[model samples]
Target: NRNAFTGVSKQGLNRWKKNTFGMFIHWGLYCHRDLAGYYQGQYYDIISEWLPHFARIPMRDYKEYASDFNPSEFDADQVTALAKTAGMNYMVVTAKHHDGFAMYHSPSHPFNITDATPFKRDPVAELSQSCRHKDLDFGLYYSHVIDWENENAVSKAPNDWDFNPDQANYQEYWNNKCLPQVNELLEQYGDLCSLWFDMGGFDVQEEADHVRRIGELMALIRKKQPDAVVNSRVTAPECEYQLDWDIKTGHDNYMEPLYIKPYYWEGIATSNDNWGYSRNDNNTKSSKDLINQLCSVVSRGGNFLLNITLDHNGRIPQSLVRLLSEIGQWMQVNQEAVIDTEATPLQTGFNWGVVTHRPATNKLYLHVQRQPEQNVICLHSLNNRIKQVRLLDNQIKGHVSYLQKTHTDTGITASTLNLQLGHNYDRMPLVIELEYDGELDINPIVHQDRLAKVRLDTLNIAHFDPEKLTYRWTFQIQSPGRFALDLVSLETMHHKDPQWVHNGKTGRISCGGQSWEFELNLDKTDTNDAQVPWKNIHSRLGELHFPQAGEYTLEFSELPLAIDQSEKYGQDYINLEYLQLGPRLA
Candidate 1:
């Protein structure tokens, strides 16, 4: 391997980007231990796949599960069929987890499922064959260095969540074992559509070596399958023609990323708690929740790889099957919003839900997650003339109102779209496709950003800050909580007086027709700038409590005590940058 290594080519990434949704299966010998059966009271709390480490089961004892794991009902075709039913175009199964037991046949390793168990079948090959029959893309997930069976592995201990290569013969382990098994997975399988590697070079000294080894592994994969895709966790560096390690998932309001830059990113979420099968782990996401997450992922230019676990008999839970079928029904009617779409150029995220657009089809989908307080939803800053707006759930033209910008200048034409939602909407996301006459150069609606104040790119202390303008803003709060309003600035003096006014400076805020004299302690410096994150904290103006939520007038005012800065580097004036309303640790 060379230093100038990237990742998978553009052709492979294009296929990955279009799929938009997939399935992840984690089945292995640990499933037989049935933390639900013998260890329910003793060790069921830990994930089934990691019992060797979490519940502190010895490797000798854990390896004995292979004798009892006689999964005669294991059917890969049924699994992939369910995947297709869930509208997933691809599926990835774990060939080997941190347990170091290969689910498939490995010529390089003796302690695989095929040789150690009476089941005597290569499940990975079975799944691959099943996927091929249904025309579904197939991939394998492998634990790169966390092999507990081998003492020479990077993870020196079973519970080593993090890897430190300096522990053992690290480079020697890389050349002979780690690199060989990786190539074995690629060569043994006919043509893998994708390869997923778990943790390897994660925040340590081994990062340099880890990066180099991954480069070498992918180089070998490229020679075998030119169209194979790889995830970002393998320490692969970022490039345009390369696959990004963009794996993201959380219980956020919406599943879209905060940034606008798009790559070959994928979100992995589970049907229930823990990746492997567990009877006690009952924290499951609803079908609506999964669908919302899947749509949001695609809308933000990433694929959703949802997870499911297999029982002792290698059969998935019937509840998951029912959920996938339910999702398949929804996809039947409203798939146009998901399949083959890109992120909306309209940067303004709505109070109700989010939107995804298809410029090629001149279609924009408005995803409404909640029932509106009013019977209307408006798309502000939509520059295009909407030719048609229709509900995707059912093919019917809907009446919509188009409003142009109240004021226009310099050949800029801005427009807002108003849809009559008509009170009748779904409990889940309701999609309405807005087809533009051509294309939309829709700009985002400007508001008081919770981050460093809005509209100012650079803070010119000598010119703007010391007793000049009282800022006025009218904004809405996204969540209701105990938060702080903080003033963020650099080089601001932090001295405060017992009284409101000090150093010829006074500040106050007005909201809901109530006002109070706040402090503008200029002695404060970057400490105020670093902590007063408006999104996460509350106002230092004291808690502005609102029992109800809506648009309210929030304005900033300061006593302009006629003051100017010296021409000497403008060092004499106050350098106020942002006023943030952030979350307090209530």
Candidate 2:
């Protein structure tokens, strides 16, 4: 276990988990930069905060935008109220970003909002007060390293055209800015819920010293606010370092695990492509996607941190405001199922949606993210006695057609819940509340193998590594039988370079203590003059033999390539769209 220790008490950890949903604000001087061109062209592809670095804007020019960053409309009261209406229990704003400018008043730094910007008000203080009044725990995000404006920062030094990185002094930056600003935040903020640190030791060579520095910060946090939650990004994640912090965090805006994690963790995601406001960045996830994402996180026993970006004027985009309002509407009814809820005892997610449970009330919530083909949803191996069932939105308790069937041999019970949802597709999730009695006994469901071919789509993934694109699936053969397995590329055309098409590249699949190495062959056809596309490929991976009708997990991954081969062709496992399993034909 990477997390060898945690300083937080069990009760404190539980409190952190209870804050299931939070709002993450990424606002800074970069928000003022016009991605569409301040003076005509566009740098839309770049992250807004990294504009100074990506566009090579000098520290002096970037600091000039701070003068233009007059967020006159930034109403702390209105923002906190909106958060309360959106069912957020907590808020974490970027106090300082990589641009090396603090969003709040920083006694340790001159390049801060109150000191440099036209708007001299202390936003951090106002938000602290407003959040407390609104009953929402507040937190701050500090870029511990990677300050592009600071010459001494380890990650990304000042503009190479203007300043030299070779002569940078790391200790000077740490002593002058980082530690003092952090100390100010801890001292001024009224009982901060968390301190989110980012970009730690991305390129620093001194691993031993960096690790110790992280310990010092952790000790500081412990001293000031014993209950303040800390994220794993306090140090470089790849480096072998350990700290007794609170919660483990995945990459920015991504954390979706198949099963419940035993320890505390958080999943943060940006609403749009960019974490900070960008004029040209319009690609945004729908409210439905965000809501389902929140449920997905909570179902896996993790907190969801949904991010939003504010414009230079300190106003949230209308689209995002509506998105939050829509989610708030959903939360009005389903808040009970999300906030302070426990992970489903079932241990895995269904194809239709995810599930959460409240042990205290013996309540199970089924968030129907996707409507099932039939009005009935089947839950396998449920031993609890259902007392009442109803829709969470309307609160109209009524009886519905429910069937419970038990397998005599295995003593496993399958529950079929019938719904009266009409033909109209509802974007909002239909949260079905189930009140039960007695102890919860939910054995993981296993797919029954049959003569008919069974296919597991990518969406039915048991576990997925977004970075690697590798995933696993679990199923069962009804009886001991031999089966044929094929890796089918379901898509009509793949969006990759024709030169890199599979073409004898080897891939691997494993199940039942056995693995098969198979070669990939792509069938390319005609294409446009601009680009070439390949026809769908279906390769026979190998045969599968199940000793008994027990559950079996299939893991698909790519074989290691030779050191001489290019790294681009290494991720062929992603092209293996789905797996087809059935009885092996003679």
Candidate 3:
């Protein structure tokens, strides 16, 4: 293939995978501006990095923010030290953002931190040097496509007022700014662990031009920084550049997988609503949630890149500092469970939390984020015999209660390990270490008639494709009859409660070639509050029938709106939650 860029060293990729957890820093001229603003009568709240574009600030005005971008309190060494203290193995700083302002001393482009601001220190240089001194892998994030400042550059939502899209030239912008700056970052910096690129899609008219430009950039990165890992966003997937990337990087701050991806991937998360420094974006994820997010990603054989944006003064926000410190404290005790660990062999549909496995010692690390009922945890259909079980947080615990075995009709024995842990564990995710012998055997969940309610959480959604928004699950049914399928949604401020009116959109559920469609509505009058961060409301999606007892698979998918209804109302839909299967009341 003409566009293929290879020769990526396996050692480099392995080094990154070994690191597992890293820090993502988003710093730029936008840091000086507030995330929300009022334009005419309309008000807008947007990500700090894209504030200029959102507020429709012309280049003449946006340039002023760059001049005022003097980060006097910035300490590159301290930043690297804090990341190390947070137990991160690497750091990826935004060397340049979509606003076309470089955070480093770019000789090719004078619109950079060193030349544009009064506090003229090369932050990229300082961070790279400090990371090396502190024994941490260093990387840089470059916005390859979108440049709001450059007149010739291209953006999805271009500044048509100042630089009309009619005359914009992507080829000229690439040659003059994008290509040279990327080359500068690679050539100037020494052996970067990664080169994170952003905004890959391009206009249809510039397809061929983008293909050539992206191919050259890929080739350049391969030759110049062969050992440095790059993201799939390096090339335009829409244009079919067919360029190679070391790993798959998820969009924005959210990425979850039901199973381990064949290729190495990453999940980037932010502490607050905005990736860049925001004066008003106070909604932050709790330390418990963040830690669980880490376990969730690592358990699926991927790295977690937690983000913390530097304040306008070039200092890490105290709130973020405290957040990182708390997570670091958790890492202090449970670092071994996360770092260099393999994906969990057990299935991920457990209600408690995610799990990670260490092959060297045949140990399993269960991150119990959600406490189970009666302080008891169960491992279903596990073939391994429990050698020992203890808390990784050093909580004194007793031995395994029992290794109950069940013999099936086929003469296969299945062992279930149950542990009785004490109450009131202070930690969010109380890490429990389990030592087991023999091969890992995790069988499908079995639904018994007596135990009528079979809980299938969102994690149980098998082979989930986010794009298609379809979920599938397979389980063994010991007894078959009419069963009610209910969608149990835990409402929170983060996830708003489902609305009664969905503009003619319906959800489809099917099993054994029998399908049924139901309206996306919930009965809000009988809502119940289930502790903090969760308000419970159940929406029953019609009953499903099973003629005979056997293994069964159920697929539930969100259906698109009717053509006329969609035209009137946008594609706003409900976020599906857990499912429950039980005997029909009637």
| Best candidate (score: lDDT) | 3
Each candidate structure's TM-score, on Cα atoms with residue i matched to residue i, is 0.72, 0.82, 0.84
In model 1, where do residues sit more than 4 Å from their true spots?
Answer: 1-6, 36-41, 156-167, 202-207, 236-257, 395-427, 447-586
Candidate achieving higher TM-score, 1 or 2: 2
**Mind giving the per-residue lDDT tens digits that candidate 1 earns over 415-511?**
4446654533343567878888865676544332222122211111113333455545444443454446665433311111111123434567776
Clashing pairs in 2: 253-268, 253-269
Residues forming the 10-long window of minimal summed lDDT in candidate 2: 525-534
Ten residues in sequence with the least summed lDDT for candidate 3: 561-570
Best by TM-score: 3
What are the Cα lDDT values of the candidates? 0.61, 0.71, 0.71
User: Per-residue lDDT of 1-586 in model 3, one digit per residue for the tens?
Assistant: 3225584678888899899999999888877743233333344576777777877788787777677777899998889988998899999999988888999999998899999889789999999999889999999999888888888886676777688887987778878998899989999879999989867874434666667777788789889998888887766655543666778775344334345666777888888777888776677767777787788778878898989988878888888888888889889989999999998776534546678899789889877776554455555546667788777766545544545456566333344445566534344677778888876656645343234456665445455554685767876565677888877543333321233334345778888778988765554323221122334456777787777877678877775312101111123534333567877772
Off by over 4 Å in 2: 1-6, 9-11, 33-41, 156-158, 203-205, 238-241, 395-400, 423-426, 449-586
Sort order, TM-score high to low: 3, 2, 1
